[PDB]
Every structure is written in C-alpha cells, then in structure tokens.
C-alpha cells in the first residue's frame, strides 16, 4: 500500500514522584511524528511546540473551564487513577526465577519473570564480588507485566572455583543466591 | 521519578483505525476494542479489581478522528513518513528441551501503527495458540508491539517471525532455533 497516511495521537501522561506527593500531567497532541501542542501542569497553560499547534494553544487557552478542569486534573484524574489500580500495579510483586549456566567463555545469570523492574544482580568468585568483566542485556520488558535480565561474567573457570549470582528484588525479604561449581 | 500512567489514543486515515489504551510504566493495563465497543484487560486479574466505562473512550476517538481531519487540511495534506521496525525474537525464560516456553517477537521504533506479523514453524504459518498486544506508545512518538507464540522447545523445529510494514521494501524475517 502506497497511499498517504495521516496520524493523530493524544497522550495524557501522569508522572508520580514519592507516591502521590508530587504529580505532573502532560497532555500532548502529536500530528504524524511531531508533537504540536501540550498542557504541562507545572506550566498551567497550553503551549505550542510547532507552528501547527499555535491555533490550538490559542483556542484552548481562551476557554477558562478547560484551564480550570486541566489544572485540577492532577487530583481528579492522576491521583484518582493511581489509587484505582495501586494494589495490582504499584503493589505488584512477582518473584524472579534465577538460573546460572555457562555459555562459551561466559558465565550467564538468567533472572526471569519478575515484577517490578527494579533489580540488583551481583556476581561473586569464591565469596568475593567480581564487578569487572560484567555485561548485562539490560532490563527486558516482555510486555506481559514481567521482566527479564541476563547478567554475563567474562571468565575462563578454573576447576574447584565456585561462582555465585546474587539477586536482590522487592519481591524477596533476603537475596536469591544461585551457585555454580567448575 | 517512580511511576507513569499513560492514556494513549490514536486515529489513522485512510485506514480509519483508532485505538484507546492505558499504560502503567510501559505495560498496558487495558485497551478498548473498537469493534466490540468493550474493555479488554491485559491480565484477567485487572478486570476483577478495577472497572472502566468504554463510551468515554469511544467519545474521545470520535474527537481524535475529527481533529485528524482538521490537522490533515491545516498541514496542507503532509503525510506520515514511514519509519520501519526494529524486530527482535527472544524467549520468555531460558530454553530447556520439552519444557513449555513462549517465543516473543518484539517489533519496535515504527510508524504508522499498521503491521502484519506472522509466526512460521518450519516455514509454514502457525495461526494457532498465538497472541499479540496493541500498538504501545513510545516517547519518540513511534510504536512498539509484541507477538507471542507458546511453544515446546525441540531439536527438530525452526521458527521465524515475518514482519511486513510499509517502511520496509521486503518482509523482515527473524529466526530462532534451539542451540546445542
């Protein structure tokens, strides 16, 4: 299909810092791939980002009920919607499945199926932390409310050497430890 | 920061395809099915602890269609430049023989939000057991999407993810097979 396409996106972004202490609303209108106009609660009015957005920022700012409604939305909408799903979003905890395996020479630590994305993975060689030669895939979001990470250790293991992968996550009270002997 | 909740909607012409969805830290809470005019929760649990009135979502889409038609004229009919996707095939967990797993096709950094994704099991299209997500938003104003294929790790099987997008000249085929 070679026919031209015209796309319009509307986004309301509620950004929460220290629970619901500080909240910020961001209304963004995007024509094709260029954001044209926006309402930032920290500013208090519609602002044109591109020339295309100038009639809208001008039009929407002339409507007092809009500016009234949008200035209060951090409480009526953002703080409301955060409470609506707090127990299964903010309070969601899924314990990761930790697996250590060699993949040549590299020693892989697979941490999968966890929630939230906030994780710490530490490698150890005979009880001592090995910070150098550590390479991660980063945090992989699988799109089903679980994450995964792969934390590799560049090492040519000597016999008798015990490698340890230590994982720390909000889901567990104490760190998850997986051992691997050469 | 700590958390971000996004109400993301789009309308696309001439396709006449709209979308309304909620995102919590990148992950879809729900979307509104435009045909069935009803709320589709990402995980069933969400439907048991929270509720939604989809007519508000469908009223927003009518306005998005109306505003797209205004912007189309205003921009002197400037169309979208196709941005082709970055395709990645990966598994949900480390692969073990005969242990059920899920193959993920991550289609990222693309626009407009229109793709054909097909899973191929030994060259033939597997149209059964598959699932997908809606077009998820990005900060660069492009889309991301995921396609899933629950499978049983085998030594005698090969998989491919076939992605077709208008920004690509030929289909993008991403391979996966069990190693060692």
């Amino acid at each position: 299909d070679t026919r031209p396409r015209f796309l319009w996106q509307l986004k309301f972004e509620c950004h929460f810092f220290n629970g619901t202490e500080r909240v910020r609303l961001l209304e963004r209108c995007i024509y094709n791939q260029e954001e044209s106009v926006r309402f930032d609660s920290d500013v208090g009015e519609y602002r044109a980002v591109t020339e295309l957005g100038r009639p809208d920022a001008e039009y929407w700012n002339s409507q007092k009920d809009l500016l009234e409604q949008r200035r209060a939305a951090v409480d009526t909408y953002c703080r409301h919607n955060y409470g609506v799903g707090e127990s299964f979003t903010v309070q969601r905890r899924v314990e990761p499945k930790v697996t250590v395996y060699p993949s040549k020479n590299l020693l892989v630590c697979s941490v999968s199926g966890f929630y939230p994305g906030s994780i710490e993975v530490r490698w150890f060689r005979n009880g001592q932390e090995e910070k150098a030669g550590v390479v991660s895939t980063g945090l992989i979001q699988n799109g089903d409310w679980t994450f995964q990470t792969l934390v590799m250790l560049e090492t040519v293991p000597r016999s008798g050497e015990v490698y340890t992968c230590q994982v720390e996550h909000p889901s567990v009270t104490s760190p998850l430890t997986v051992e691997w002997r050469a | 920061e700590e958390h971000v909740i996004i109400q993301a909607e789009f309308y696309l012409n001439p396709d006449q395809s709209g979308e309304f969805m909620f995102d919590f830290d990148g992950d879809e809470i729900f979307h509104v099915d435009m045909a069935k005019k009803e709320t589709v929760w990402r995980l069933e649990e969400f439907g048991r602890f929270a509720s939604f009135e989809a007519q508000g979502a469908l009223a927003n889409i009518a306005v998005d269609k109306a505003n797209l038609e205004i912007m189309t004229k205003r921009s002197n009919y400037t169309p979208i430049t196709n941005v082709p996707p970055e395709v990645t095939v990966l598994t949900n967990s480390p692969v073990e023989l005969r242990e059920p797993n899920v193959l993920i096709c991550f289609i990222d950094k693309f626009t407009p939000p229109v793709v054909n994704v097909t899973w191929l099991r030994n060259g033939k299209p597997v149209t059964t057991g598959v699932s997908e997500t809606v077009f998820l938003p990005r900060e660069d104003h492009l889309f991301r999407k995921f396609h899933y294929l629950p499978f049983l790790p085998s030594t005698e099987d090969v998989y491919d993810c076939r992605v077709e997008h208008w920004g690509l000249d030929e289909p993008l085929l991403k391979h996966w097979e069990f190693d060692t």
Partner: peptide, 13 residues
C-alpha cells in the same frame, strides 16, 4: 474503583 477518561478537546477549526 473506575478508571477515569480525560476528555479530548475539539481543535481550532
């Protein structure tokens, strides 16, 4: 509890 929709606004004609 119910998720709230923020109403889209009609653009400059």
């Amino acid at each position: 509890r119910f998720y709230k929709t923020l109403r889209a606004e009609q653009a400059s004609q």
